[PDB]
Amino acid sequence: AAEIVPSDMYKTGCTLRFPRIEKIRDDKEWHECMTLDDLEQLRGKASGKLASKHLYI
DNA sequence: AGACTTGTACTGGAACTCACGTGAACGAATGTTT
């Protein structure tokens, strides 16, 4: 997703911008899902934008 | 916005075919030897 933005249609209080599926993980169990704490940490890490680090070459 | 599906056009390689070249083999004539 491009970023995480506030919303009122979802329980987490936030929704993704431009979401798309990259892979249906057949190796991850259901209990390995993200947690609200991790989502809050990711949201606060870079002001909601999911692109933080710098391209290198 | 983004991602996939469908339609059009193009280019390169596979396959097939013909032309040309090279290699080996041979019956008959001629020359040489006995």
Residues A33, A30: Cα–Cα separation, whole Å: 6
What resolution, expressed in A, was reported for this entry? 3.1
Residue written as token pair 């491009």: A2
Distance, Å, A51 CA → B29 C1': 96
CA distance A36 to A29: 17
Backbone phi and psi for residue A13, each to the nearest 5 degrees, phi listed first: 80, 5
Which sign, positive or negative, has the C-alpha torsion A17, A22, A47, A39? positive
Name residue A6's beta-bridge partners. A14
Chain B bases closer than 7 A to any CB of the protein: 1-3
Exposure string for A30-54, b = 16+ CB within 10 A, e = fewer:
eeeeeeeeeeeeebeeeeeeeeeee
A38 with A32: CB under 8 angstroms? no
